[PDB]
Design an enzyme around this catalytic site. Structure first.
Site, short mmCIF file in Angstrom:
data_model
loop_
_atom_site.label_atom_id
_atom_site.label_comp_id
_atom_site.label_asym_id
_atom_site.label_seq_id
_atom_site.Cartn_x
_atom_site.Cartn_y
_atom_site.Cartn_z
N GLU A 1 0.81 -1.22 0.00
CA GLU A 1 0.00 0.00 0.00
C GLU A 1 0.85 1.28 0.00
O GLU A 1 0.73 2.12 0.90
CB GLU A 1 -0.95 -0.03 1.19
CG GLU A 1 -1.94 -1.19 1.14
CD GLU A 1 -3.15 -1.00 2.05
OE1 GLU A 1 -3.03 -0.25 3.05
OE2 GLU A 1 -4.21 -1.59 1.76
N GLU B 1 -5.31 -8.74 -0.36
CA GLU B 1 -6.28 -8.46 0.71
C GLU B 1 -7.60 -8.11 0.06
O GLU B 1 -7.64 -7.27 -0.81
CB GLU B 1 -5.87 -7.26 1.56
CG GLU B 1 -4.54 -7.36 2.30
CD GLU B 1 -4.25 -6.09 3.11
OE1 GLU B 1 -5.20 -5.39 3.53
OE2 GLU B 1 -3.05 -5.83 3.37
#
Ligand SMILES: [Ca+2]
Ligand SMILES: [Ca+2]
Ligand SMILES: [Ca+2]
Length: 627
Positions: free
Chosen positions: A181, A303
């Protein structure tokens, strides 16, 4: 109306080389077999035996151990900003020996295929100091390009720590993501420095090369996107991020990785990726990869689930777990439709995260497989399963050869798999109300010997409880599927189910993408080298990103012939979202298609984009429809 759902258990559904359910790819969670949490504080004595073996659940993903080594490794005396090779080998060798001694877990390695990844810091070279009082080199020359030291560390770490299993050490990772991220820390979080996006993407190329210098066969991927929101700033976000990543680093990645979270409760608002939205996000990645790289890169979803903003400062509740469950099931169904281009999809649930409990706030980690017996009232007692276990109970036993299913409501997704005498029939509701289904099962002469129904739904509305209703049935011609619910229907037959036909799905891409819409102006897309058979069906996939108020019913011409667009498309109208971004799936008369195809769109109003036009062709081995 009512919804008709049809299962043709004699028709194999082939997509690329995939004809089977891949349990390791899909029925998994974000954990490892050698976490400390497995063997203490739990009501169940052998939790690995119950969760991993009995339910047949796979793992995993892990960022902590590599972070710890990085933060405590000595700087290289001969080079500033680099980790010391000898001390790195030392620390890695301590961990290895600990894995070597941990013999209770070695029989669980067959359930494990590790996704390795770095948390953003200190790994990204932005000057952040380690606990040993030094930052990774921020140089960027042709001889030491940006991330060289980060890469060398990653490369060395992998070579030094990992073995081949058991007493040789922990098995090598199946996948190495570069960094977790990164644009969230770089550009989007509050008080983000907004360093160079460009330099992040170059960073990926340099990390890959460094990783392969020490481990030549290791797969590397990126950029592990927290929030892939392509339509924002009138597609400026796409243009600045995924487009540039594919241009700069696409060719050096063995796979692409993103995260996909629904927002079912963000300040009272419901903004979903499940349904047409995620289809548009994934179509865009594939289409542009085809245009620029000439191939579709394998896609990992490291995810996914829901992020539950309104409940994330609340104690644990069954309801909060439900919100995650409903997103997980719908997304998984959508990933299963692209199984040939998905290498791995991982629902975000950790085992326990005993250290993620904050004693000041009393807030436990918001996505746990296990919770304490007395939650929510107090954080005491032995650990027991959260409601998240219901996903793994719902999907228990599901495996086998994929068989064709279809449904006349795009808000209802279905799929099915045949294993010898058993047939698994999975149905998922994207609509926000109950849907009464009429079920037809064709291709067998004989009725099923028994039927087990698994139905996962919400009881009691908001702040209620998920229920997993499991029961036996002698017959099931009708079934009410509850709001956002999933069912898995398991048919048991007396004899082996015979699969004697094949439907082959093939996905075709256009020559171009991402076209501005102007009222009255034809946008023409070209899809070529299409291969047909005598019997088949087809679907055109219109990726549209437009402000609300604007039309989602253009005039559609395929090879000069008129094709109707349906009112209803997959999932919701996206009311709470800032604009519409989604793929409208359009059935098209197979007789109209040919080798080279002209898809022509005309809207009556201005603004927005057609992001992608792609097409699914379904070629039958026989006249399975009987037309
Ligand atoms: Ca994005
Ligand atoms: Ca189908
Ligand atoms: Ca709909």
């Amino acid at each position: 109306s009512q919804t008709h759902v049809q299962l043709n258990l004699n028709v194999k559904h082939k997509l690329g080389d995939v004809t089977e359910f891949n349990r390791p790819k899909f029925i998994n969670f974000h954990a490892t077999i050698n976490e400390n949490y497995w063997d203490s504080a739990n009501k169940i004595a052998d939790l690995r035996d119950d969760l991993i073996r009995k339910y047949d659940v796979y793992v995993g993903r892990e960022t902590g151990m590599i972070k710890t080594v990085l933060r405590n490794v000595k700087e290289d005396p001969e080079r500033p900003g680099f980790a010391d090779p000898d001390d790195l080998a030392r620390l890695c060798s301590q961990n290895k020996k600990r894995y070597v001694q941990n013999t209770k877990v070695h029989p669980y390695e067959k359930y494990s295929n590790l996704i390795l990844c770095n948390q953003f810091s200190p790994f990204y070279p932005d000057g952040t100091k380690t606990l040993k009082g030094w930052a990774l080199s921020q140089k960027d020359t042709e001889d030491e390009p940006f991330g060289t030291a980060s890469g060398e560390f990653y490369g060395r770490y992998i070579k030094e720590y990992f073995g081949e299993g058991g007493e040789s050490g922990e098995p090598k990772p199946g996948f190495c993501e570069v960094i977790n991220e990164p644009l969230w820390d770089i550009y989007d979080k509050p008080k983000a420095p907004k360093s160079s996006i460009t330099k992040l993407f170059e960073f990926h190329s340099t990390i890959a090369a460094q990783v392969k210098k020490f481990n030549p066969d290791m797969k590397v991927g990126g950029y592990c996107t927290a929030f892939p929101d392509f339509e924002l700033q009138n597609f400026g976000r796409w243009n600045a991020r995924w487009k540039q990543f594919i241009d700069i680093a696409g060719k050096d990645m063995d796979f692409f990785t993103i995260h996909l979270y629904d927002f079912p409760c963000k300040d009272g608002k419901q903004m979903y990726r499940k349904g047409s939205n995620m289809e548009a996000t994934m179509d865009m990645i594939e289409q542009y990869s085809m245009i620029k790289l000439g191939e579709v890169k394998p896609l990992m979803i490291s995810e996914y689930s829901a992020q539950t903003h309104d409940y994330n400062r609340k104690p644990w509740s069954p309801y909060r777990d439900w919100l995650r469950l409903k997103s997980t099931n719908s997304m998984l169904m959508q990933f299963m439709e692209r199984t040939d281009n998905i290498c791995y999809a991982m629902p975000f649930a950790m085992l326990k995260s005993e250290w993620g409990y904050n004693p000041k706030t009393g807030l436990a980690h918001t996505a746990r497989m296990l919770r304490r017996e007395n939650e929510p009232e107090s954080f005491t007692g032995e650990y027991v399963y959260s409601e998240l276990i219901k996903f793994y109970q719902l999907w228990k036993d599901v495996k086998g050869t994929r068989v064709e299913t279809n449904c006349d409501n795009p808000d209802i997704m279905c799929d099915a798999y045949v294993d010898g005498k058993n047939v698994y029939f999975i149905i998922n509701n994207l609509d926000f109300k109950p849907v009464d289904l009429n079920l037809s099962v064709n291709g067998t002469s004989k009725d099923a010997k028994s039927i087990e129904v698994r139905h996962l739904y919400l009881k009691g509305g908001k702040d209620g409880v998920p229920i997993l209703d499991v029961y036996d049935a002698k017959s099931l011609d009708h079934f009410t599927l509850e709001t956002e619910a999933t069912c898995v229907i398991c048919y048991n037959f007396d004899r082996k189910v015979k699969i004697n036909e094949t439907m082959e799905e093939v996905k075709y891409y256009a020559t171009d993408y991402l076209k501005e819409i102007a009222a009255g102006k034809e946008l023409v897309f070209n899809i070529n080298n299409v291969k047909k058979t005598e019997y088949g069906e087809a679907v055109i996939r219109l990726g549209l990103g437009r402000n609300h108020g604007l039309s989602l019913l253009p005039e559609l011409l395929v090879n000069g012939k008129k094709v109707d667009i349906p009112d209803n498309f997959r999932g919701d109208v996206q009311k709470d979202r800032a604009s519409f971004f989604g793929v409208i799936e359009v059935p098209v008369d197979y007789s109209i298609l040919k080798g080279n195809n002209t898809i022509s769109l005309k809207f009556p109003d201005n603004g927005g984009h057609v992001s992608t036009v792609t097409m699914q062709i379904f070629n039958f081995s026989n006249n399975i429809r009987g037309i």
